[PDB]
Amino acid sequence: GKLPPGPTPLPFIGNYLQLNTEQMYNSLMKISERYGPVFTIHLGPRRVVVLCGHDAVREALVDQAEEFSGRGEQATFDWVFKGYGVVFSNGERAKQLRRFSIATLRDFGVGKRGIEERIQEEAGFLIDALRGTGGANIDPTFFLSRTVSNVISSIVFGDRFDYKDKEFLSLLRMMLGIFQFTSTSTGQLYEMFSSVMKHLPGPQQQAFQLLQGLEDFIAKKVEHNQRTLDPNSPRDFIDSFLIRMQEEEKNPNTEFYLKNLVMTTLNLFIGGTETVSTTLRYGFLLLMKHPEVEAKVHEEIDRVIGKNRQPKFEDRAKMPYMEAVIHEIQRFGDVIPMSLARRVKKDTKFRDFFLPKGTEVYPMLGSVLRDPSFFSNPQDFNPQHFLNEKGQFKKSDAFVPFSIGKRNCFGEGLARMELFLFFTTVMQNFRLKSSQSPKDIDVSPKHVGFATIPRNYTMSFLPRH
Ligand code: HEM
Numbered sequence: 001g002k003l004p005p006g007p008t009p010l011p012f013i014g015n016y017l018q019l020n021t022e023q024m025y026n027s028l029m030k031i032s033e034r035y036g037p038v039f040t041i042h043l044g045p046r047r048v049v050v051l052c053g054h055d056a057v058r059e060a061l062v063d064q065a066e067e068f069s070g071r072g073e074q075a076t077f078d079w080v081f082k083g084y085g086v087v088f089s090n091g092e093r094a095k096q097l098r099r100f101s102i103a104t105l106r107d108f109g110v111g112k113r114g115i116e117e118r119i120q121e122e123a124g125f126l127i128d129a130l131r132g133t134g135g136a137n138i139d140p141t142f143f144l145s146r147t148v149s150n151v152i153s154s155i156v157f158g159d160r161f162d163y164k165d166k167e168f169l170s171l172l173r174m175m176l177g178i179f180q181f182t183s184t185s186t187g188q189l190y191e192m193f194s195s196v197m198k199h200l201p202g203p204q205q206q207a208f209q210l211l212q213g214l215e216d217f218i219a220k221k222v223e224h225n226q227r228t229l230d231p232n233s234p235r236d237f238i239d240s241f242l243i244r245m246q247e248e249e250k251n252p253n254t255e256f257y258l259k260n261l262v263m264t265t266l267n268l269f270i271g272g273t274e275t276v277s278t279t280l281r282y283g284f285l286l287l288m289k290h291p292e293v294e295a296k297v298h299e300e301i302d303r304v305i306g307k308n309r310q311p312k313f314e315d316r317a318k319m320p321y322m323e324a325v326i327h328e329i330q331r332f333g334d335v336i337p338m339s340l341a342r343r344v345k346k347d348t349k350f351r352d353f354f355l356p357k358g359t360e361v362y363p364m365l366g367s368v369l370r371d372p373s374f375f376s377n378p379q380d381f382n383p384q385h386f387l388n389e390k391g392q393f394k395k396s397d398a399f400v401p402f403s404i405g406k407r408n409c410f411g412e413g414l415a416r417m418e419l420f421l422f423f424t425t426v427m428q429n430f431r432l433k434s435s436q437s438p439k440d441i442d443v444s445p446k447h448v449g450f451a452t453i454p455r456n457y458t459m460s461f462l463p464r465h
């Protein structure tokens, strides 16, 4: 056949005029009203197939999982990774690292009791640091992301950062800004015009330095691990990969060299931190906006764990209402609304379209999360989306915040755990009063580009009474 239809592109600038860089999501949703759920767009010179809604996205990413297992691009990030590392890599490189990483993560306790404790501990440290504010009005952004980043850092560096660490903050700051940048208008403008804007002055320059700053940190971290390596006992993820690097040194087709080490650790660092950090941060803002939902959450916590012992992960299966709330946040929040770009591994016949080898696919996860065929009033934050008539947890095939298919988020495991525990724990220990009245809180995002960024806010954590 021929390609998905779509608006007609002008030279160089592609479909710029039919897009609004500040609202990429909306702009493509607007166009889908004109061309159907499967269309082609032009982001500067990148010819992209946009997939929308539960069916289109599934049929590609799952039913034709192999054809769609390629990795497309994300210009800002790829500026630093240049195709190296587990995320922005392809083919042999990608299959190799993804394997190693899933396996290694698991070896250091992921999915098991080993990291559940590490999480329960760090959750401990948070409650402390929050009682430490003693009801004061604060921006939870860093409290949260400090706590999160510590779980992943615990794994990849083999040791948590102390909250006071002036560097730890520095780094957290950078991930925020990168994410923040890539969700701005200019950030999306950069996706289209990167081969030009890279040589120009502007926000992307500050953005580049932020990534270079993180690669520098990582690189300096790695070299310390080499210089102190016990090839018999790995302390952290970096060791495992180093240990493996040594083994593959004679094999010239090996995917385990230094660059891939640095970038995979960076990937794991950024990916493991800023996505969960942002989710929690949005959730709290929503919970405050629906005290109705806040209370019900407390009730189900008191009734199932009590203010007595600290929460355990299996404690999630007796608590549908909190599962429903975490889901509904993950759905409403829509942290990575357009996913990360995929790519077609070979020429592919999809429905009755023809997609060349190497064409980019933007799988609009948001459009699935908001598909009104699976969520009535998809626009509302309301946990009843994930609750049947009898107050039980009801799955949904459209709950795809971690994407689906051959390159889906292999952190979902870790992420689900981090998410349940932190939310539950903080709720057990505090009630939430906002710096404003629930009638005023504005929950709609400050930015939406590559990620969804909640607005900035302050809040107080008060004890329960
Ligand atoms: C709310 C939390 C998170 C969300 C919503 C999320 C979402 C996503 C999405 C949309 C993708 C792209 C899927 C695709 O290939 O099309 C992805 C992939 C990925 N995620 Fe996450 N993620 C989260 C947390 C994490 C965590 C905790 C880690 C590690 C600890 C992580 C590491 C990765 C990596 C390395 C990939 C690339 C997979 C590959 O290319 O094979 N993410 N995730």
Ligand SMILES: C=C1CC[C@@]2(C(C)C)C[C@@H]12
Binding pocket: 077, 087, 266, 267, 268, 270, 271, 272, 275, 336, 340
């Ligand atoms: C390295 C990163 C930064 C953000 C990210 C998420 C979606 C895993 C793509 C991974």
